[PDB]
Structures are given as structure tokens and as C-alpha cells.
Design a protein around this ligand. Structure first.
Ligand SMILES: Nc1ncnc2c1ncn2[C@@H]1O[C@H](COP(=O)(O)OP(=O)(O)O)[C@@H](O)[C@H]1O
Ligand code: VO4
Ligand SMILES: [Mg+2]
Ligand code: NA
Ligand code: NA
Length: 381
């Protein structure tokens, strides 16, 4: 059967298949090549992906995300206790293990992180089956390099619960380097820097690849820095604007803020390919339309400290790997946020003009590599 690669991401998931010599990243029901890592529980149904994210403002306590922050962890973990303060859904303690508790079909139900993640994997599985016209069973699923065995095991368990046969759990930076065939170059060792800025996390990884061995020399970053923060800065910018223009503070209107956030995330993506973007929202608040624009320069300015700051973990990784900048053979862009021109310029400048590996859509590069690995492990490459 066709073996697939699945990036089970903190904020977005992505599924690819290697067939007939190339990787095809598979579009979902709405034609989207990534799917939000969201699950929602209502009076009648369980929603996964876009459908779940789309109704978050109307059903916030029963809409679950960030399961990857809980997966493989214990309830009393300092990380878990800290993150819980920021989620609108309830996390409870079941004999040491955290569970998300929600209302579902009129009943109180609780789910382990790997159960929530299994639902996301089910959706990714169904997405591949919709495209392929065939049952999909075998998969390679990816995780951050820093994941321990409990986290790796729970992620595997998520796959099993979804009916996936998990061929192997591989590291995200390894998937990215495989995508670019950086293990297959004629020569000795290659030093590879993976610069991965996603929706919720920032990961820098330095790999030394030789004889099929992907030695992790160092990792660095920020588990709470991603595209979400850039959207936040934009949202705050426009809330302030609306306040000045209309003498209204829309802050506590969850639906209004959500529609603004949606518009902001969209404008941000647009600004990666254009120097300006329109914000167009009918009846944002009290039937007041919000039609405006934002320039790439203003988006950059709003986020300047955060963008520049990404270079600090790059320096930390280099010193921990005992390598000079000039000793890096390949630099790889991973994660949707690395599409931002300013971030690319900052990194290329930091490496004194060195070209970046970015031809593969960075939000798809992890799935791409996982798909290649899946084909290898199923004997189809
Ligand atoms: N063209 C783009 N420009 C800027 N940001 C983007 C673009 N496309 C996607 N993003 C952002 O990338 C983030 C998601 O990254 P992704 O790698 O897909 O998921 P994850 O963080 O779960 O691995 C989101 O913040 C999203 O808004
Ligand atoms: O799913 V990630 O937050 O490791 O890019
Ligand atoms: Mg990612
Ligand atoms: Na992802
Ligand atoms: Na990341």
C-alpha cells in the first residue's frame, strides 16, 4: 500500500506521498496543503482541522489545540502547569497523566494528548486516502529532535490509535535534510543548519551528516516563538487603530478579535509575496466595516525585535556545535514563518550572503522528507 509521510505539527499538520519519482504534498478538502492541528467537540459532532479552527470563537472551551505541548508529558511537569494558564480548554490530572476535558455531545469527556493527536492523524490519513483512492496504513511520523522517548512513544501511540502503522518516528530536522538529499552528496561529512520557524515554535538544529548518520551536534530556539506572535503584534496594532477611529475597544468580543486575527494571519502570508496587503472585514464590530491595509515595512517594524532575535539561537547553536559560520555546508529553511522575506534576509546576511535551501515550501519540507523516508522503508525507493 502507499506509505505516507506526516508532519504532525504544533499548529499545522502536512501529509506527503512519494510516488513515481517525486513527492506529492496532498491538499485537504478545502485545497489547503496544510491542516490546522485542531479538534473541536460540539453537541452533535467532532470536528478536525479547518472546521475545528473555524468555529473556535463560538466554542472556545471545547476546541483543543497544542496537544503536541502535552504529548508524552506528566501533569505535574513545570511546562504543562505553565502552558495550562494560557489555554481556554481544561486540562485535568488522571493518575499523573494530563488529560484534556471537554463537553462532547452533552456529556463531559476527557482525552489523553495522544488521543487528540490521533484525531489529527485520522484526518491526515483520510486526506491522503481521498487523494490516492486507496487505503493508507503505513506512515513515517515526525517529531522535534528534542523529543524524549516518552514523547516519541506517545506520538507513535497517536498513530496506532488512528489505525496507522508507524514505520518510524523521525526527527523534523532529519526529515528536512532528507528532503534536500543532504545525506546523498558525493563527499565526506556535511554540516547542516536547520532554521525552523513555525506557528508556535522556533527550532535551530545543527546536523553533521556522514555515512547515513545524522549526528545532532546542537539544538537551540524558543518553544514559545512563532507566527502566532507576529499575528498577535498585528492584532494589537489594529485593535489600537479601531479604538482611535471608532472609540470602541473590541478586545473582549471574542468573535470580533478572531475575525481580525484571521484577517491578520492572511495579510501576513500575502506580505511574504507582496509589499502591501488589504484587510477586509464586513461588520467587524457593531456593523462597522473594517477595510484598511498594511505595508510590508509596517509588518516588519511591528515585529523587528522578534525577527532579529531569531539570530541569537543560531549563534548559540553554532557555539554549542563548535563550528564557525563558514563551516556550515547547507542552510535549510523549514516552517511557514521562514517564508517572511525579512527573516530570510536576516539569516542570509548573518551567513554573509550564503544561499539558503528554500525551493521546497518550508511548511511542507518536513512532510516531504517523511514521505521520502516512508517510501524507503516500504521498499518503494
Ligand atoms: N507565506 C507565509 N508567510 C508568513 N507566514 C506564513 C506563510 N505561510 C504560513 N505561514 C505561517 O506559518 C505558521 C505555521 O507554520 P507550519 O510550519 O505550517 O506549522 P508548525 O508550526 O505547526 O510546524 C503560521 O504562523 C502561519 O501563519
Ligand atoms: O510541529 V513544530 O512546533 O516542532 O514545527
Ligand atoms: Mg513545524
Ligand atoms: Na507543520
Ligand atoms: Na518549529
Amino acid at each position: 500500500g502507499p506509505a505516507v509521510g506526516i508532519d504532525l505539527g504544533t499548529t499545522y499538520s502536512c501529509v506527503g506521498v512519494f510516488q513515481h519519482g517525486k513527492v506529492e504534498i496532498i491538499a485537504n478538502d478545502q485545497g489547503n496543503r496544510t491542516t490546522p492541528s485542531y479538534v473541536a467537540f460540539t453537541d452533535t459532532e467532532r470536528l478536525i482541522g479547518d472546521a475545528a479552527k473555524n468555529q473556535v470563537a463560538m466554542n472556545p472551551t471545547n476546541t483543543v489545540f497544542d496537544a503536541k505541548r502535552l504529548i508524552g508529558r506528566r501533569f505535574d511537569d513545570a511546562v504543562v502547569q505553565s502552558d495550562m494558564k494560557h489555554w481556554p480548554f481544561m486540562v485535568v490530572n488522571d493518575a499523573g497523566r494530563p488529560k484534556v476535558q471537554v463537553e462532547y455531545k452533552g456529556e463531559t469527556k476527557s482525552f489523553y494528548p495522544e488521543e487528540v493527536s490521533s484525531m489529527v492523524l485520522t484526518k491526515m490519513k483520510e486526506i491522503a486516502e481521498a487523494y490516492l483512492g486507496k487505503t493508507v496504513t503505513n506512515a513515517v511520523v515526525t517529531v522535534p529532535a528534542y523529543f524524549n522517548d516518552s514523547q516519541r512513544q506517545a506520538t507513535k501511540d497517536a498513530g496506532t490509535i488512528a489505525g496507522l502503522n508507524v514505520l518510524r518516528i523521525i526527527n523534523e530536522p532529519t526529515a528536512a535534510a532528507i528532503a534536500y538529499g543532504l545525506d546523498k552528496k558525493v563527499g565526506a561529512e556535511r554540516n547542516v543548519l536547520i532554521f525552523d520557524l513555525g506557528g508556535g515554535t522556533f527550532d535551530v538544529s545543527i546536523l553533521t551528516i556522514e555515512d547515513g548518520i545524522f549526528e545532532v551536534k546542537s539544538t537551540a530556539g524558543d518553544t514559545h516563538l512563532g507566527g502566532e506572535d507576529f499575528d498577535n503584534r498585528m492584532v494589537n496594532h489594529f485593535i489600537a487603530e479601531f479604538k482611535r477611529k471608532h472609540k470602541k475597544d473590541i478586545s473582549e468580543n471574542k468573535r470580533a478579535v478572531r475575525r481580525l486575527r484571521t484577517a491578520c494571519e492572511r495579510a501576513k502570508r500575502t506580505l511574504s509575496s507582496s509589499t502591501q496587503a488589504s484587510i477586509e472585514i464586513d461588520s467587524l464590530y457593531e456593523g462597522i466595516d473594517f477595510y484598511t491595509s498594511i505595508t510590508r515595512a509596517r509588518f516588519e517594524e511591528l515585529n523587528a525585535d522578534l525577527f532579529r532575535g531569531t539570530l541569537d539561537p543560531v549563534e548559540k547553536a553554532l557555539r554549542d556545535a563548535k563550528l564557525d559560520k563558514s563551516q556550515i555546508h547547507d542552510i535549510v529553511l523549514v516552517g511557514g514563518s521562514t517564508r517572511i522575506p525579512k527573516i530570510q534576509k536576516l539569516l542570509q546576511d548573518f551567513f554573509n550572503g550564503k544561499e539558503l535551501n528554500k525551493s521546497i515550501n518550508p511548511d511542507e519540507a518536513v512532510a516531504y522528507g517523511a514521505a521520502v523516508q516512508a517510501a524507503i522503508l516500504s521498499g518503494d525507493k
